[PDB]
Every structure is written in C-alpha cells, then in structure tokens.
Amino acid sequence: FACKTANGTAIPIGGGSANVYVNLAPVVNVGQNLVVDLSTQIFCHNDYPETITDYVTLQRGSAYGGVLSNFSGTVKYSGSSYPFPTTSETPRVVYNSRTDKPWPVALYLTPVSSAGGVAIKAGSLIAVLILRQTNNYNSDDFQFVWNIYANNDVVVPT
Ligand SMILES: OCC#Cc1ccc(O[C@H]2O[C@H](CO)[C@@H](O)[C@H](O)[C@@H]2O)cc1
C-alpha cells in the first residue's frame, strides 16, 4: 500500500509524510463553503490485492493558520461528514485494487462572521491530514501524513 499526489509527491510502503499544494477559490463570502477536495490530489493503491485487503481511515485532521482562525469546518470522508478539526477516527475505506484510487477526503470551510480580509495566505499551511492504513494480513498500522498548503490567497469580502 502506497500513495501519490498530483504535485508529484509520494509516500511509500510503511508510511511517511508528504506535502500537497492546492489551488483555492480566491474569493469566498461569509456563509459559503470553500471546498478543498483532496480526492483530486491524493491517490492510493493496494500492492497485493490478490491476497490482501487494505483498510484506510482519516485518523485525524487538524487545521492551521488562517483556516483554524477564520473558518468553521467540516470534513467529508467517503460519504460522511464530521467536524473539522476532527474529534474521532473515521470508518475504514476498503482498498482492494492496485489501480490508483482517490483518497475520498474533502474539506468544507465556511468563513466565520468576522473573517473578512485575507483569510488564508498564499503558501501557508492550512491542514494536516493523517491517513491510517491497516490490512487483513498482518499487524501493519501505518500513518501517511499529508501537509496541505495553499497556493494562493483567499479573500473574504466585507
Ligand atoms: O509473496 C508475494 C508478496 C507480497 C507482499 C506482502 C506484503 C506487502 O505489504 C505491503 O502491501 C500490502 C498491500 O497493499 C499492505 O497491506 C502492507 O501494509 C504493505 O504496504 C506487499 C507485498
């Protein structure tokens, strides 16, 4: 089991850390969600699906910088929705193929009432998402840590 991104970063068997750089809607109003869809960015696969089934959770999701300060968030993982920053590990998604499958995570971030201005700075860390992978084969329990960075400023009109 290993993962790769659209930015050309990757994390091998056994886990590790990688950076993800995302384009964000440049203008978002109070009451509207800024969507950060990581399923277009992060892809994983099973290396031996002929014999092994892999299980993948979002173990934890943390917010940083402007995102933590200026937004109320939710995270959707494989059809279900939770508070973001997270308060529990998600259910497992089965990875049963060697063909790359998107990691089905998206953040929905809505500016708080007082968030006006540059609410996220270009280049800043906005989130850290921990993917936890296990299987039905042995005791493997690996963390794939994704540091999510903004490629651009996001402005909330006032
Ligand atoms: O004799 C032929 C063989 C073989 C094989 C056994 C284990 C294995 O583990 C990786 O791939 C597995 C499947 O993706 C993961 O569950 C593991 O955590 C690990 O990433 C990969 C290949």
Automatic annotation (TrEMBL):
Q: Which residues form the signal peptide?
A: none
Q: Which GO terms describe its biological process?
A: cell adhesion
Q: Which cysteine pairs make disulfide bonds?
A: C3-C44
- Cellular component GO terms, alphabetically? pilus
FimH mannose-binding domain span: 3-147
Protein known as: FimH
Give the source species.
Escherichia coli
The gene coding this protein: fimH
